[PDB]
Amino acid sequence: ASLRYRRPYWMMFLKGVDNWKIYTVIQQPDHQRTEMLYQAWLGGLDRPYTRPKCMANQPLWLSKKRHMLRKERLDGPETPLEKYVLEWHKKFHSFQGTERPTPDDLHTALDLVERPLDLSYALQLLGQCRNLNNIRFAKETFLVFLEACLRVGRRDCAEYALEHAEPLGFWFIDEDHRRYLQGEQTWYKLSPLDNLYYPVEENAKLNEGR
Amino acid sequence: ADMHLQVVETMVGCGTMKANDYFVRNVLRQFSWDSRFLEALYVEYRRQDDVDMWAELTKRALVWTARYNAPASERLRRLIEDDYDTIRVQTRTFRELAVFQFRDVEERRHSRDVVNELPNPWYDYVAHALPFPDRDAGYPDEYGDLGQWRAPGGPGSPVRGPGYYAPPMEGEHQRGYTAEWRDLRNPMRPPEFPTPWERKYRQYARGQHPSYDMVYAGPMPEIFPMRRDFRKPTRWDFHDIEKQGKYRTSGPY
Amino acid sequence: APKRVDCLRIHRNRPLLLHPMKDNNKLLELSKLPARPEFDSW
Amino acid sequence: DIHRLRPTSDFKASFKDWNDLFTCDKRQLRVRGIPRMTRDAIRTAVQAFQNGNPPERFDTKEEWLYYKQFKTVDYSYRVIPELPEKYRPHQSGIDQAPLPDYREINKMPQWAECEERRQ
Amino acid sequence: ARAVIKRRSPQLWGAPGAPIIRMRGHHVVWKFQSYDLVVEHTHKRRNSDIRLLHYLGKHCPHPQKSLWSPDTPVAQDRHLFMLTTVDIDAFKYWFGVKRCRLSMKPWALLAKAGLLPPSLTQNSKIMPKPLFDKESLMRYYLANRKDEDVMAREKYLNYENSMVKTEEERAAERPVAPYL
Amino acid sequence: RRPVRYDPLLVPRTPSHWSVGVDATDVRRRWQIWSPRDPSIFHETSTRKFQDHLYEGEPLFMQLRQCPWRTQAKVSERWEMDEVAI
Amino acid sequence: DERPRDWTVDEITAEDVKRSPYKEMEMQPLQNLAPRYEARPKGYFGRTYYSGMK
Amino acid sequence: AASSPVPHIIGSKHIDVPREHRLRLLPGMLYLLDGDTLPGEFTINRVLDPTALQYYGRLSSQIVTVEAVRMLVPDDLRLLCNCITFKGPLHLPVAPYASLASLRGASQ
Amino acid sequence: RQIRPYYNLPSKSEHGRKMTGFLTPYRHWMWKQNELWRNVHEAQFEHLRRVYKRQWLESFRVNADEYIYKYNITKAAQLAQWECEMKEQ
Amino acid sequence: WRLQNNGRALALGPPVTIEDEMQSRFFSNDQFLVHSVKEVLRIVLQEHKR
Amino acid sequence: PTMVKFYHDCLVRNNRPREASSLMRLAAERGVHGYEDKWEADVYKGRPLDSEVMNESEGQASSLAFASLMLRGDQRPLPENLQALLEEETTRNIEAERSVPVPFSAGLHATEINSVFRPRVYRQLWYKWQHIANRYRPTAALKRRQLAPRDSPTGIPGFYRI
Amino acid sequence: IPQEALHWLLRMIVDNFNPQHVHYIAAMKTLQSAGELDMARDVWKIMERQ
Amino acid sequence: RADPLNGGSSMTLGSKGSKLSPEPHRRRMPWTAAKEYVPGVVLNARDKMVLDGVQLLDIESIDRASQLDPLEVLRAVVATREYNISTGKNIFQLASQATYNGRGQRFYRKEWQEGTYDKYVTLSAIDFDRDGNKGTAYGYITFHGETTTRPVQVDFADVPGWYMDFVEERAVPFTGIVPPPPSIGTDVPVDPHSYRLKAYPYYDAPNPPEFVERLLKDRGVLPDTP
RNA sequence: AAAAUUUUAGGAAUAGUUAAUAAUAAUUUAUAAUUUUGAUUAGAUUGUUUUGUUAAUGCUAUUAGAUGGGUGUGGAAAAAUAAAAAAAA
Ligand SMILES: [Mg+2]
């Protein structure tokens, strides 16, 4: 059940290609013309080019060039969060990249949440960091997430994350934050530099003096 | 390794309880030690205060043999076996024990049995192992016959010349073709042996059989209708190779 | 949701099989090409 | 019954009972009118059971049916794809890949619009 | 090792494989069928002009009546005979020195001949296979363990030379006459 | 089982809950005759003879068929007893 | 030093040998190879010897 | 070296050879010195990669605590040097006749 | 042929074989028991192999010794006869 | 799991002590006399063991 | 058809996919035998000619490089400083790939491999006897013993080649 | 087995060859290294009979 | 060759085993070397039911029109987390949630402990790719007390099914180097109270009664009835 | 790797050629090589006691089923019809 003697030897352990029978007969003139036209149709080249005789996937340099030349799906970033998302995709989602996200980068991305769309983008980035990148969250990650949710006014997402944060990666949740999200208490944090409770809706109720 | 073995043996004999440490520090990692090291180190292992420590040391020694390619010797395995009642440590593989039980039982039964003590010529010896037979059966002929144009046959054929007449030859070739070559069809004498193996069979090299009073006991020839060929397909005939083929029918009849 | 091959009994009633010609040789295209270029349609 | 070419289950009604099945001979099977491959399989299964091997194996009918479609010349349990005539996208009628409408897809979604109108 | 392999007759390794003793049959009707015990390669060399390494003998499957009943009668003399030929020296050479393989039908035939014990597949349904228990096996070994030297001598005689001279043979070999 | 004594596990004792399919007593006689008076037997290239070259046919030889029908009976038993006739 | 210690006029030098040509001198047995017996017969294959086809 | 005197494994100062013969003679050389002084005309690259450092774990734990690992690349990039700096006395017992007894930071 | 019992590990794959070579621990234990029973048969096989090898070697020794004796006698006689013929020539 | 020897160089150390000395044919007359005394003593030891 | 096939092979060998596609489309439009189905969409519809871009460069080359390089629409240009480096990298990679010798190719293109042409006078006898012995089996091979018995000469002296 | 050296010397004689002194020395040394003194004596007898 | 089964025994082709020697039989295919393998098919065929019923967003698309509600995004994240560990946790997935990246901790397979098997790997270094669930892990292998001298790569690390028991004492900071665990018989003294050898090179486990009964019933010795 | 044996009624020239070589992968040197003792090209035909017949060393048969572009894999291409064959419990 091995293709050692049924296909050329350069195709050992070859998996995932669309059809490996194409490259067995690519050397014929008609299939060569078809492959060159397909390369032109994919674009990103200034001269007639054809794949190397002993390669099934695209060359590394050609694939990197096309990945760097493809236009972003999002154009005209209205918000600083969208600009940071574009920068993030440029920095980490490059071709064959090896740099990994950091909790500081996640915090910086979350600090720019202004509108619900920005919140959704930040949540997508956080999920990518948790699962695709497998990054352990920092201690204040849940605090930053809760602040980002409250900036837009989205309490259901915060309480869902509290209901199951261990799968999400929040391995430490403050007790006051837990009480606030459960409904035990109405204040979620305290700013010491201002000596003022938050949210402000209960700041005037609790801390009337300063 | 021999010098380190002497040191280990001396430490074991003196009973310093440090021969194991010396072996594990100097000989284990950086030498191709043999099983004699553990043979002696077992004496020191026997002197441990607790049988659990004794067993652990023995098992660790066996693991050392498995790791450092120093297979346990028969003497070491038997030494460990002799203390099986105390340690309950095994030194024979399941396959080896399974083979041994059946073999020992069969050998005991065979030895006790008297009917099968007789020798078996098919099982006891090899008769002849040389590439060539030890006695002359008559072949080769080295001459052709009627209707054989190809003589000599060349490769893989012992025929050396035409049976009856040949173009003129010279010297030793003529001598061989006229006198010296084998001649199976000669009725007076068989092809003679080389000297001196010919003078001692002088009286036996005359004619074929001395009887001349033979009474033919076979089937009578069929005069009519005088069939020509008898190519009967057989089932138990082992001379079918010789039976098949054209042969000249010229005899007393 | 194989193909028969014609046989001809040549000599001693021995069969001969005329297998289809290989698709790579020039003779098939030679047969496909027109016979008279000036007269026949291309 | 584990092989497609020799289905033993098709002849279950032929045998009266366990004793009949296990005392049946190959000549008796041929008299009863059971095809060669099926009766050989039945006899082999009975002999294995007698020797101590119960008929416990893997039913390979589905696997063989799956590997049939790939058109292996020797049925070697390997994947041999068929090369289509028109395989590249440009030669099937598509002049060029469809350029997405970035302006259309950059519009804020309905949930975002409703959230903003609520805010 | 081939693009499209011979599905109707595959093997385990490349050609030509290890020598194997098997009963090659003819292509005739059953009535006149006979087998040839021969040693050949794992892959049949039907292509070349040399097919077998050696010819061990011929076996006749059809039994024949006893043509020697009028001779000195013994027990079961009048039963049908199954005549067969077997080379012994060549078989022992290929089996021991060359270490050739062996099929099951030749193995059964040689089991009848007495050269080899009954084959692995010559199993009856009367008794099932044995069950092995490590503790029982070890107990039996400890009860009946042979001497080291005795076992060494036994295996030396079985494997190395069995024609070991005694003291009498050595003394007879030693010269005693005026040594010239 | 436990001269020599074999281990009961290494040499099992033919489980008693099984049943006997055929026995030495389940055979029946079969008489056949290959008369040379039949030309199809007298023909030289005939397989109906145990002799290769001596003669044709076989005078009233007896074979032994078997009757694997002991299990069709309502009750079937086998009694293992040594022969006492001879 | 690049000249092998086993170098001589015959130039038959055994590489990867660190024993001097004088220190060791014996017909020591070889363990790397294996003895080989003849497998292809010449002429005789079985049954009757007859001439033997030499 | 902790049990036997190696003749030229410990030197007073780095081996001094003319720059012409430096590339020809230095490869294969190996010697120990006191203190982490490095030869000149050598760009220094400290090995901070844990994947590379893991192979020195047994050496650090069982022989001598390994402090620094450095690679020196010459001007022509044709003669590399590997410098391993060990901190602390030898864990293994040291013979008085052993070569490492000479070093101050080894025998201690 | 490697047996694939139904109670092996099922590979839930639509792109390959439906059963895997992994076996239950009982199958491993049963397989060892069958391995032990075949080991009994193959021990006598190797024993007979070595016995036949040594028998063949000893037979070759004896027959070769006898042949060498006879052949030496024959060649001595032949050489003497050849010398006489050469002298006469 | 273990240090092993290589065809190029040996790393596991030798199992038997071997005297590094020339052969008898390369020995000098006095050296061969010393060798002969050693061989006579060796034969004495062998006969004693026998 | 022969001229079309030879020209297409030459264009593919010389790496002219645009010209080869144009020739195939022309053959499909005219209706050349065997080319009635080899019709493909033009992927160079908006692209200018190589001669055009060369003349433009002869007469900003940095800007003209963007026109020279084909974009897929969803592929967008990058700043020219990085574009020049990327183009140099691509040129170096392509030259390195095309400089590698092809084993067993004898320094010949796939169109030149196993391509021997002789005029039809060489095989006219073969053609005539093929269209007689296999008049209704054009794909069958014209082997001897179809037109002559054994021990008898076949019709064509040279037969296959010389 | 050690018998094979003697077997090969006998095979060399049977195949119409003249065993050289190096062959005899190798046979005797191999048999002595295997402990076959009687077989070494047999090799010497073979050399004498040749 | 180097390691035959039952020596040289060619009674049948099956008596040689499924493989002749542990080293690769052909010099040109080093991947044929004998080693313990894992059920990759089952361990990689994750359950799709968790993914079902929850919307997903491709990584490439970042357009606004393809964005989803943040609650849907959160449930997608938790669904993906469940899906990635449905068939078991990866060694990298275990190391990402441990202090000092789990350096110095012991990892073992599910089947490395049951029966007479007692094997674990002490982590020494891990290099994550951009996909944190995959990478390369180097550690020390300890098998029945004996521990290797140098860190080696962990086979089938990416394949899930690993278990770790984190110990704060064994944690090694990135500044230092992970020390190889001591050999129980060689490095540290042998102690029956701390560690006890489960199986020695000649040990064979006794036959389980359930296995014996099953074998006898299959062979037909014991009277198994419906 | 060598030696011998080698067809045609109307018989003649053959050629990526012979040898030498510090030359793998020949920029050189030579009065080179084949052949009327039958060459090369073209026709016929699977080469080395197997058939038939006769008093015959005559005449007359014969699938020993054998080889450069399809994958450089493999120890070895012979690898895409079949050909009675047991292929790792
Ligand atoms: Mg001629």
Tab-separated table of C-alpha atoms in Angstrom, chain M:
chain	number	residue	atom	x	y	z
M	1	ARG	CA	21.288	-9.705	12.020
M	2	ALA	CA	22.066	-7.792	15.203
M	3	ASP	CA	18.947	-8.809	17.167
M	4	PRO	CA	17.177	-11.880	15.784
M	5	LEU	CA	14.054	-13.403	17.298
M	6	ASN	CA	14.667	-16.887	18.736
M	7	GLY	CA	18.077	-16.749	17.100
M	8	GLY	CA	18.159	-18.070	13.575
M	9	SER	CA	14.910	-20.049	13.377
M	10	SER	CA	13.373	-20.393	9.906
M	11	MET	CA	10.757	-23.067	10.598
M	12	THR	CA	8.137	-20.736	9.104
M	13	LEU	CA	8.145	-17.176	7.816
M	14	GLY	CA	6.127	-16.102	10.856
M	15	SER	CA	8.758	-17.402	13.275
M	16	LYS	CA	11.074	-14.538	12.255
M	17	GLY	CA	8.589	-11.990	13.616
M	18	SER	CA	7.007	-9.008	11.918
M	19	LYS	CA	10.498	-7.513	11.512
M	20	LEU	CA	13.916	-9.126	11.206
M	21	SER	CA	16.122	-6.622	13.042
M	22	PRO	CA	15.429	-3.347	14.887
M	23	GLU	CA	17.758	-1.385	12.604
M	24	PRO	CA	16.388	-0.431	9.164
M	25	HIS	CA	16.621	-3.311	6.713
M	26	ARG	CA	17.573	-0.984	3.841
M	27	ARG	CA	20.202	1.727	4.248
M	28	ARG	CA	18.137	4.144	2.128
M	29	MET	CA	15.036	4.122	4.394
M	30	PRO	CA	16.051	5.076	7.954
M	31	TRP	CA	12.378	5.668	8.810
M	32	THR	CA	11.836	1.886	8.836
M	33	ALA	CA	13.748	1.544	12.121
M	34	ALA	CA	11.805	-0.352	14.772
M	35	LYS	CA	10.274	1.801	17.506
M	36	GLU	CA	7.115	1.977	19.574
M	37	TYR	CA	4.327	3.825	17.764
M	38	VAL	CA	0.955	5.281	18.723
M	39	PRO	CA	-2.572	5.078	17.270
M	40	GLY	CA	-2.211	8.307	15.328
M	41	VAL	CA	-5.476	7.810	13.440
M	42	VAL	CA	-7.600	7.612	16.582
M	43	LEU	CA	-5.588	10.229	18.464
M	44	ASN	CA	-5.957	12.722	15.590
M	45	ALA	CA	-9.587	11.956	14.629
M	46	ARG	CA	-11.074	14.503	17.006
M	47	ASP	CA	-14.806	14.749	17.656
M	48	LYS	CA	-16.596	17.201	15.358
M	49	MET	CA	-19.775	17.330	17.466
M	50	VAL	CA	-18.312	20.070	19.676
M	51	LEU	CA	-17.502	22.147	16.589
M	52	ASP	CA	-21.005	21.498	15.256
M	53	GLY	CA	-23.630	24.014	16.331
M	54	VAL	CA	-21.104	26.848	16.773
M	55	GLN	CA	-20.132	29.390	14.127
M	56	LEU	CA	-16.501	29.664	13.031
M	57	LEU	CA	-14.400	32.412	11.459
M	58	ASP	CA	-11.433	31.807	9.173
M	59	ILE	CA	-8.132	33.339	10.251
M	60	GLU	CA	-7.478	34.903	6.839
M	61	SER	CA	-10.752	36.850	6.721
M	62	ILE	CA	-10.734	39.989	8.877
M	63	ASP	CA	-13.443	41.847	6.973
M	64	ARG	CA	-16.165	43.528	9.013
M	65	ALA	CA	-19.035	41.783	7.207
M	66	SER	CA	-17.670	38.397	8.333
M	67	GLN	CA	-17.445	39.374	12.013
M	68	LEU	CA	-19.675	37.699	14.590
M	69	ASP	CA	-21.277	38.653	17.882
M	70	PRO	CA	-18.770	38.640	20.780
M	71	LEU	CA	-20.784	35.996	22.650
M	72	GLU	CA	-20.644	33.814	19.539
M	73	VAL	CA	-16.893	34.455	19.410
M	74	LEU	CA	-16.511	33.377	23.044
M	75	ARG	CA	-18.492	30.179	22.538
M	76	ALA	CA	-16.435	29.529	19.396
M	77	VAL	CA	-13.248	29.916	21.447
M	78	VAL	CA	-14.443	27.496	24.124
M	79	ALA	CA	-15.638	25.066	21.437
M	80	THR	CA	-12.227	25.156	19.740
M	81	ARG	CA	-10.519	24.592	23.092
M	82	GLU	CA	-12.748	21.566	23.696
M	83	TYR	CA	-12.164	20.283	20.154
M	84	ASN	CA	-8.374	20.507	20.388
M	85	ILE	CA	-8.333	18.331	23.532
M	86	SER	CA	-11.327	16.081	22.801
M	87	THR	CA	-9.054	13.071	22.197
M	88	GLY	CA	-6.566	14.024	24.917
M	89	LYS	CA	-4.091	16.727	25.894
M	90	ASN	CA	-0.847	17.286	24.013
M	91	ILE	CA	2.528	17.503	25.728
M	92	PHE	CA	2.805	21.078	24.443
M	93	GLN	CA	-0.714	21.774	25.714
M	94	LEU	CA	0.411	20.528	29.133
M	95	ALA	CA	3.664	22.510	29.049
M	96	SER	CA	1.946	25.773	28.090
M	97	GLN	CA	-0.045	25.734	31.355
M	98	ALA	CA	2.889	24.998	33.689
M	99	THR	CA	5.376	27.330	35.335
M	100	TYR	CA	8.833	27.422	33.733
M	101	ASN	CA	7.186	25.748	30.711
M	102	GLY	CA	7.093	22.486	32.658
M	103	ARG	CA	10.870	22.094	32.508
M	104	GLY	CA	12.027	19.389	34.902
M	105	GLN	CA	8.610	17.712	35.080
M	106	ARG	CA	7.822	14.111	34.155
M	107	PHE	CA	5.558	13.277	31.213
M	108	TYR	CA	4.184	9.812	30.524
M	109	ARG	CA	1.809	8.163	28.085
M	110	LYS	CA	-1.417	6.450	29.117
M	111	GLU	CA	0.053	2.985	28.486
M	112	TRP	CA	3.557	3.697	29.827
M	113	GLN	CA	2.478	2.781	33.373
M	114	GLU	CA	-0.113	-0.003	33.137
M	115	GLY	CA	1.199	-3.543	33.345
M	116	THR	CA	4.929	-4.047	33.780
M	117	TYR	CA	5.625	-0.899	31.739
M	118	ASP	CA	7.135	1.938	33.804
M	119	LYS	CA	8.462	4.724	31.580
M	120	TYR	CA	8.486	8.518	31.709
M	121	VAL	CA	10.418	11.394	30.150
M	122	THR	CA	11.835	14.256	32.217
M	123	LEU	CA	11.489	17.449	30.196
M	124	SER	CA	14.635	19.456	29.481
M	125	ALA	CA	13.649	21.885	26.718
M	126	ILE	CA	10.712	22.687	24.453
M	127	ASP	CA	10.621	24.774	21.274
M	128	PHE	CA	7.133	25.824	20.212
M	129	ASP	CA	6.378	26.687	16.608
M	130	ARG	CA	3.967	29.499	15.762
M	131	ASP	CA	1.291	26.858	16.391
M	132	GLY	CA	1.749	26.315	20.119
M	133	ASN	CA	0.167	22.856	19.994
M	134	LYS	CA	3.122	21.573	17.930
M	135	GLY	CA	6.882	21.906	18.186
M	136	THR	CA	9.904	19.931	19.335
M	137	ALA	CA	10.475	18.576	22.848
M	138	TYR	CA	13.789	17.324	24.256
M	139	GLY	CA	14.002	15.401	27.512
M	140	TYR	CA	15.627	12.605	29.467
M	141	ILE	CA	14.112	9.124	29.225
M	142	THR	CA	13.862	7.014	32.385
M	143	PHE	CA	12.897	3.355	31.928
M	144	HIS	CA	12.652	1.145	35.031
M	145	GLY	CA	15.038	3.425	36.910
M	146	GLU	CA	17.722	3.659	34.236
M	147	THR	CA	18.027	7.185	32.829
M	148	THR	CA	19.666	8.265	29.585
M	149	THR	CA	22.825	10.374	29.645
M	150	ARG	CA	21.797	13.042	27.114
M	151	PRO	CA	18.473	14.710	26.268
M	152	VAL	CA	16.789	13.207	23.213
M	153	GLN	CA	13.775	14.226	21.166
M	154	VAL	CA	10.385	12.982	22.336
M	155	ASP	CA	8.726	10.717	19.781
M	156	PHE	CA	5.077	11.395	18.910
M	157	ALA	CA	5.068	14.470	21.142
M	158	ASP	CA	2.519	16.317	18.997
M	159	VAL	CA	0.171	13.314	19.131
M	160	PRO	CA	-2.136	13.828	22.143
M	161	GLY	CA	-2.554	11.429	25.028
M	162	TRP	CA	0.072	12.677	27.470
M	163	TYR	CA	-0.181	13.114	31.232
M	164	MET	CA	1.969	15.175	33.586
M	165	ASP	CA	2.034	15.524	37.371
M	166	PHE	CA	3.540	18.924	38.129
M	167	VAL	CA	5.881	19.165	41.122
M	168	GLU	CA	7.045	22.586	42.290
M	169	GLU	CA	10.382	21.167	43.461
M	170	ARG	CA	11.216	19.758	40.017
M	171	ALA	CA	10.600	23.088	38.253
M	172	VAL	CA	13.780	24.445	36.658
M	173	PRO	CA	14.036	28.166	35.798
M	174	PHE	CA	15.126	29.124	32.301
M	175	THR	CA	18.350	30.617	33.696
M	176	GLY	CA	19.654	27.226	34.811
M	177	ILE	CA	19.859	23.890	33.030
M	178	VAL	CA	17.646	20.892	33.793
M	179	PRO	CA	19.702	18.244	35.623
M	180	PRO	CA	19.268	14.669	34.385
M	181	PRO	CA	17.314	12.556	36.880
M	182	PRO	CA	19.613	10.195	38.784
M	183	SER	CA	19.822	6.533	37.897
M	184	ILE	CA	18.099	4.586	40.658
M	185	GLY	CA	20.644	1.772	40.590
M	186	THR	CA	23.709	3.573	39.247
M	187	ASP	CA	23.699	7.182	40.477
M	188	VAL	CA	21.754	6.906	43.746
M	189	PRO	CA	21.935	3.767	45.926
M	190	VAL	CA	19.376	1.016	45.477
M	191	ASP	CA	16.528	1.305	47.980
M	192	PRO	CA	13.566	-1.118	48.100
M	193	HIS	CA	11.514	1.411	50.080
M	194	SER	CA	11.740	4.333	47.643
M	195	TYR	CA	11.521	2.536	44.285
M	196	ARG	CA	10.885	-1.146	43.582
M	197	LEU	CA	11.538	-2.750	40.201
M	198	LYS	CA	8.278	-3.955	38.667
M	199	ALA	CA	9.935	-6.321	36.181
M	200	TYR	CA	13.477	-7.623	35.747
M	201	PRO	CA	14.932	-8.740	32.379
M	202	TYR	CA	13.752	-12.326	32.972
M	203	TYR	CA	10.401	-11.532	34.624
M	204	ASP	CA	7.081	-12.626	33.134
M	205	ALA	CA	3.768	-11.538	34.612
M	206	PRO	CA	1.450	-14.316	35.839
M	207	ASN	CA	-1.460	-15.230	33.598
M	208	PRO	CA	-4.633	-13.325	34.588
M	209	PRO	CA	-7.561	-15.591	35.500
M	210	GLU	CA	-9.918	-13.736	33.158
M	211	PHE	CA	-7.496	-14.135	30.246
M	212	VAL	CA	-7.019	-17.833	31.022
M	213	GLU	CA	-10.781	-18.386	31.197
M	214	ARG	CA	-11.339	-16.502	27.935
M	215	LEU	CA	-8.635	-18.514	26.165
M	216	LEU	CA	-10.013	-21.831	27.418
M	217	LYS	CA	-13.558	-20.909	26.378
M	218	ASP	CA	-12.349	-19.832	22.929
M	219	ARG	CA	-10.398	-23.077	22.493
M	220	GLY	CA	-13.433	-25.029	23.700
M	221	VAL	CA	-11.979	-26.561	26.867
M	222	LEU	CA	-14.388	-24.954	29.315
M	223	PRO	CA	-18.097	-25.554	28.497
M	224	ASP	CA	-19.179	-22.082	27.416
M	225	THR	CA	-22.922	-22.019	26.739
M	226	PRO	CA	-25.375	-19.300	25.603
